[PDB]
Amino acid sequence: VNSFSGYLKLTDNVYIKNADIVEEAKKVKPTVVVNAANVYLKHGGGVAGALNKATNNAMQVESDDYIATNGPLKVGGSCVLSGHNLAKHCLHVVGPNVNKGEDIQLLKSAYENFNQHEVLLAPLLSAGIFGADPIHSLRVCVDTVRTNVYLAVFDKNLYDKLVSSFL
């Protein structure tokens, strides 16, 4: 497990790669994979939908079981569930959605959940439909995460911009 290869080292504990996170998980077999989730743990698009489809909807049925007892998650909160065939554990983290007016300061609180796990395979948080600048999100990651995080970035153009600014 944790057979990470081909990653570019940005800091002493942050690594980056231009790759598909679902294909990486099947190749690395990580201990933890991170899901960019919403407060109701509905995996209907983005990274969440791709992970759930790779689990043949096993992630969605487990997520609904957790919501039935916990209710909605808080922005910046997280929960650890099973990783099914993709990893041992899946950490669902809810970043702030600046389109809904949620505070961008809460992105530090979202990344702080990574410090509960020794090594993670993760995407960037609060980007895309959550509306935060991906370069800003990566800045908050390298500033708050003290454990080993391996970042998969799908877009080649975005990948080159992040590398040019952080290496």
Author numbering: 3 to 169
Paper's wording?
The large, multidomain Nsp3 includes an ADP-ribose phosphatase domain (ADRP/MacroD), which is believed to interfere with the host immune response by removing ADP-ribose from ADP-ribosylated proteins or RNA.
The protein crystallized in space group P1, with two molecules in the unit cell. None of the polypeptides contains ligand in the catalytic pocket, but there is an N-cyclohexyl-2-aminoethanesulfonic acid (CHES) molecule bound on the surface. In the ADRP-APO1 structure, while the described geometry of the β6–η3–α5 linker remains similar to that in ADRP-APO2, the entire section and the neighbouring η1 are shifted away from the binding pocket.
